[PDB]
Amino acid sequence: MKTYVPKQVEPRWVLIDAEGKTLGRLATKIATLLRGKHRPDWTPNVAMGDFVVVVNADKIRVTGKKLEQKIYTRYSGYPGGLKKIPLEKMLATHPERVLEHAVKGMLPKGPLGRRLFKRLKVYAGPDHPHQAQRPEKLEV
Amino acid sequence: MKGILGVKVGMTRIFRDDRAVPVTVILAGPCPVVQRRTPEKDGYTAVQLGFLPQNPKRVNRPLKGHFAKAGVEPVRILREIRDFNPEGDTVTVEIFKPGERVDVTGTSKGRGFAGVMKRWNFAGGPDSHGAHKIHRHPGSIGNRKTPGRVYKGKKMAGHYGAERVTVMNLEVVDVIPEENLLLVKGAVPGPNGGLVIVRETKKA
Amino acid sequence: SRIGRLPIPVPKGVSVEVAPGRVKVKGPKGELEVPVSPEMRVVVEEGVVRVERPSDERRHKSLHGLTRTLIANAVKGVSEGYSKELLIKGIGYRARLVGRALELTVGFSHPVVVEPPEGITFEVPEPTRVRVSGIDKQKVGQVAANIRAIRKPSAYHEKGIYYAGEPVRLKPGK
Amino acid sequence: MKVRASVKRICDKCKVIRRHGRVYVICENPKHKQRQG
Amino acid sequence: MTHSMRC
RNA sequence: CGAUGUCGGCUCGUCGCAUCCUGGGGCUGAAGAAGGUCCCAAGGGUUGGGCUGUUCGCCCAUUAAAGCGGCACGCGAGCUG
RNA sequence: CGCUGAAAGCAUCUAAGCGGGAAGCCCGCCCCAAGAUGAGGCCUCCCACGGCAGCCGGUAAGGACCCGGGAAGACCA
Ligand SMILES: [Mg+2]
Ligand SMILES: [Mg+2]
Ligand SMILES: [Mg+2]
Ligand SMILES: [Mg+2]
Ligand SMILES: [Mg+2]
Ligand SMILES: [Mg+2]
Ligand SMILES: [Mg+2]
Ligand SMILES: [Mg+2]
Ligand SMILES: [Mg+2]
Ligand SMILES: [Mg+2]
Ligand SMILES: [Mg+2]
Ligand SMILES: [Mg+2]
Ligand SMILES: [Mg+2]
Ligand SMILES: [Mg+2]
Ligand SMILES: [Mg+2]
Ligand SMILES: [Mg+2]
Ligand SMILES: [Mg+2]
Ligand SMILES: [Mg+2]
Ligand SMILES: [Mg+2]
Ligand SMILES: [Mg+2]
Ligand SMILES: [Mg+2]
Ligand SMILES: [Mg+2]
Ligand SMILES: [Mg+2]
Ligand SMILES: [Mg+2]
Ligand SMILES: [Mg+2]
Ligand SMILES: [Mg+2]
Ligand SMILES: [Mg+2]
Ligand SMILES: [Mg+2]
Ligand SMILES: [Mg+2]
Ligand SMILES: [Mg+2]
Ligand SMILES: [Mg+2]
Ligand SMILES: [Mg+2]
Ligand SMILES: [Mg+2]
Ligand SMILES: [Mg+2]
Ligand SMILES: [Mg+2]
Ligand SMILES: [Mg+2]
Ligand SMILES: [Mg+2]
Ligand SMILES: [Mg+2]
Ligand SMILES: [Mg+2]
Ligand SMILES: [Mg+2]
Ligand SMILES: [Mg+2]
Ligand SMILES: [Mg+2]
Ligand SMILES: [Mg+2]
Ligand SMILES: [Mg+2]
Ligand SMILES: [Mg+2]
Ligand SMILES: [Mg+2]
Ligand SMILES: [Mg+2]
Ligand SMILES: [Mg+2]
Ligand SMILES: [Mg+2]
Ligand SMILES: [Mg+2]
Ligand SMILES: [Mg+2]
Ligand SMILES: [Mg+2]
Ligand SMILES: [Mg+2]
Ligand SMILES: [Mg+2]
Ligand SMILES: [Mg+2]
Ligand SMILES: [Mg+2]
Ligand SMILES: [Mg+2]
Ligand SMILES: [Mg+2]
Ligand SMILES: [Mg+2]
Ligand SMILES: [Mg+2]
Ligand SMILES: [Mg+2]
Ligand SMILES: [Mg+2]
Ligand SMILES: [Mg+2]
Ligand SMILES: [Mg+2]
Ligand SMILES: [Mg+2]
Ligand SMILES: [Mg+2]
Ligand SMILES: [Mg+2]
Ligand SMILES: [Mg+2]
Ligand SMILES: [Mg+2]
Ligand SMILES: [Mg+2]
Ligand SMILES: [Mg+2]
Ligand SMILES: [Mg+2]
Ligand SMILES: [Mg+2]
Ligand SMILES: [Mg+2]
Ligand SMILES: [Mg+2]
Ligand SMILES: [Mg+2]
Ligand SMILES: [Mg+2]
Ligand SMILES: [Mg+2]
Ligand SMILES: [Mg+2]
Ligand SMILES: [Mg+2]
Ligand SMILES: [Mg+2]
Ligand SMILES: [Mg+2]
Ligand SMILES: [Mg+2]
Ligand SMILES: [Mg+2]
Ligand SMILES: [Mg+2]
Ligand SMILES: [Mg+2]
Ligand SMILES: [Mg+2]
Ligand SMILES: [Mg+2]
Ligand SMILES: [Mg+2]
Ligand SMILES: [Mg+2]
Ligand SMILES: [Mg+2]
Ligand SMILES: [Mg+2]
Ligand SMILES: [Mg+2]
Ligand SMILES: [Zn+2]
DSSP: OOOOOOOOOOOOEEEEEOTTOBHHHHHHHHHHHHHTTTSTTOOTTSOOSOEEEEEOGGGOBOOTTHHHHOEEEEEOSSTTOEEEEEHHHHHHHOTHHHHHHHHHTTSOSSHHHHHHHTTEEEOSSSOOSGGGGOOEEOOO | OOEEEEEEEEEEEEEETTEEEEEEEEEOOOEEEEEEEOTTTTSSOEEEEEEEEOOGGGSOHHHHHHHHHHTOOOEEEEEEEETOOOSSSEEOGGGOOTTOEEEEEEEOOOOOEEOHHHHHOOOOOOSSTTOOSOTTOOOOOOOBTTBOSOOTTOOOSEEOSSSEEEEEEEEEEEEEGGGTEEEEESOOSSOTTOEEEEEEOOOO | OOSTTSOEEOOTTOEEEEETTEEEEEETTEEEEEEOOTTSEEEEETTEEEEEOSOOSHHHHHHHHHHHHHHHHHHHHTTTOEEEEEEEESSSOEEEEETTEEEEESSSSSOEEEOOOTTOEEEOSSTTEEEEEESOHHHHHHHHHHHHGGGOOOSSSSOEEEETTOOOOOOOOO | OEEESOOOOOSTTOEEEEETTEEEEEOSSGGGOEEEO | OOOOOOO
């Protein structure tokens, strides 16, 4: 009788506070929210998930010796251009990239997945500029 | 950290303590202060300098307003010296004393499209012994099926020069404030007539 | 057979105050602060500090003995104080105080001046005897270790910087 | 320092220790210093 | 010419 | 096998490290100087000639050193032959 | 290579904690660089024109065309 398809939804803005949470276990939930799979009307081919703001992204937490042994790498395309940055240095320099990298590695590849990444707004420290959107705080 | 905008005049040598000292002569000042980048307004510290007066009936309205807010005549060039906050409103050669060391930035002379021997000092090929139309050629540019490609940054033919170059740690041989002249020992990038920037050295 | 069960005598009048993950120790010569595992218990008795451990797993037994000595070394640090003496040996080797800093003439082309970190006091009784004084035991041993390494004991001759009581072991030359 | 896969005590003063995931032998005799590797 | 003489 | 040109050289690099030199170490049958041996380390450097098609090697004169290997025994729609 | 230090009354550079330490690693130096589509920032200029997020005409600040050339350059820039 033809599956329901929603008309363009009005997206919800939620707020998550990352302080003390485990890096991967939180990414996994931000991925779900960005994909909008918590919504009973979920549709695989439209951006209809939530917008997710995150504060205290520099106070994310991690187990074991990952602060020293977790190595992000970037390849520049040039001979010898494989750069190695440990998690310690990344938190010290570009802390918001840590949760961003982890969320992005759990989103789908392709056009839609890159757009849902743009619906994530990651911030170091407790403040965020999206007061305009009035984000509903979420206990995850 | 101090700077000034300049003009490469030409080279000569002078005689100092029975030694011949090759110099490049630079017309530096005067450089009026046109805008001040502050941490509050712009996020960093720097002076925007001006240099060489220009026909006021040659400077469009958007630039007219900019000069007006500083109270300065139209200048031909604006450049920023980074991390410089001079006390006054006009930077002259006398920010430099003889003996100080300076870094100088100009635009190198343009070789146009340049071969691999002129651009990269490649060895070329033999000029006899059977060599066949490769006397100035670069030889091999890679391997074989592994990696089956050419590295990025590979040294090859192409445009050479007419690029920003900084020569560092030149000795200041003289300052002639009556003529806004700055003598610097040794060679400076670009042609006579070219715009150059003279900053205090960063070498220790 | 147990360091950590040994009660810690507290001299009059040295104060020992307990807090989460710390103890503070105030005595005549100053005050130190001992960071203590939240897994151990630091109980204050009459002129006695005791340490209790929650179970008998190895981490608890290891922190148990560690913690007691840390409390004890600080309780001695604030009352008696700690010090190490260094002996200089060799023909041209000596030292002197230049202000509060420690100057060492030990066979280089130059002297070697050592400034005293906060909490450490330098003393040169004889030109061949250096005394490192302070309430922090770990800090006294570090500064003494630092000073010794400027000219360590030679392996063939009795010349350099020696701990007091350090044996002179040498080996032949021909 | 001897560096080898078989680290043993050489003499009765030899002490087998373990620091930072590596097995060492320390002893009053400097010839007997061993690190496993 | 001819072929590369793979002999 | 309705073709994946085959030695060496020249040119042009780039990578591995089981390191030749340069930097840091331990042990020494380490007095010093100089070495030996092992550990860490691939940033940079690692010469010009005589002989031979040679690779290699030997020789000469130096050098801090004159490293070893991979890239279709790297590179003939780049050259040589 | 250490300091302090249990487990293991001693010992131990380590299990809690703290030092020292390479031509190497990060930054620092030089050059490119916001197509960094995450397309950033500052200074200044124009401005609500006329007719059924669109529309087509005349302008604005500005720009291009053309021309005289250039230690810029294959053309282009
Ligand atoms: Mg339906
Ligand atoms: Mg979570
Ligand atoms: Mg979605
Ligand atoms: Mg979706
Ligand atoms: Mg960790
Ligand atoms: Mg898939
Ligand atoms: Mg001339
Ligand atoms: Mg003079
Ligand atoms: Mg211009
Ligand atoms: Mg310029
Ligand atoms: Mg030029
Ligand atoms: Mg030139
Ligand atoms: Mg040209
Ligand atoms: Mg050429
Ligand atoms: Mg050239
Ligand atoms: Mg040339
Ligand atoms: Mg060149
Ligand atoms: Mg040649
Ligand atoms: Mg040649
Ligand atoms: Mg030639
Ligand atoms: Mg010819
Ligand atoms: Mg021919
Ligand atoms: Mg021919
Ligand atoms: Mg040809
Ligand atoms: Mg010819
Ligand atoms: Mg060629
Ligand atoms: Mg091929
Ligand atoms: Mg081939
Ligand atoms: Mg490939
Ligand atoms: Mg150009
Ligand atoms: Mg010099
Ligand atoms: Mg003049
Ligand atoms: Mg120039
Ligand atoms: Mg010009
Ligand atoms: Mg030391
Ligand atoms: Mg054996
Ligand atoms: Mg021992
Ligand atoms: Mg075949
Ligand atoms: Mg065919
Ligand atoms: Mg075929
Ligand atoms: Mg064929
Ligand atoms: Mg073919
Ligand atoms: Mg040749
Ligand atoms: Mg090679
Ligand atoms: Mg190795
Ligand atoms: Mg070496
Ligand atoms: Mg060495
Ligand atoms: Mg050695
Ligand atoms: Mg000897
Ligand atoms: Mg020696
Ligand atoms: Mg060894
Ligand atoms: Mg190397
Ligand atoms: Mg090499
Ligand atoms: Mg001959
Ligand atoms: Mg020959
Ligand atoms: Mg030969
Ligand atoms: Mg042979
Ligand atoms: Mg030699
Ligand atoms: Mg040598
Ligand atoms: Mg040779
Ligand atoms: Mg090889
Ligand atoms: Mg090789
Ligand atoms: Mg192979
Ligand atoms: Mg083979
Ligand atoms: Mg061969
Ligand atoms: Mg073969
Ligand atoms: Mg070949
Ligand atoms: Mg070939
Ligand atoms: Mg051919
Ligand atoms: Mg060939
Ligand atoms: Mg080929
Ligand atoms: Mg071919
Ligand atoms: Mg081919
Ligand atoms: Mg033939
Ligand atoms: Mg000890
Ligand atoms: Mg003990
Ligand atoms: Mg530890
Ligand atoms: Mg350390
Ligand atoms: Mg350090
Ligand atoms: Mg150097
Ligand atoms: Mg630039
Ligand atoms: Mg832009
Ligand atoms: Mg820019
Ligand atoms: Mg976009
Ligand atoms: Mg986009
Ligand atoms: Mg990106
Ligand atoms: Mg945007
Ligand atoms: Mg912009
Ligand atoms: Mg900015
Ligand atoms: Mg043109
Ligand atoms: Mg022209
Ligand atoms: Mg033209
Ligand atoms: Mg045209
Ligand atoms: Zn032994």
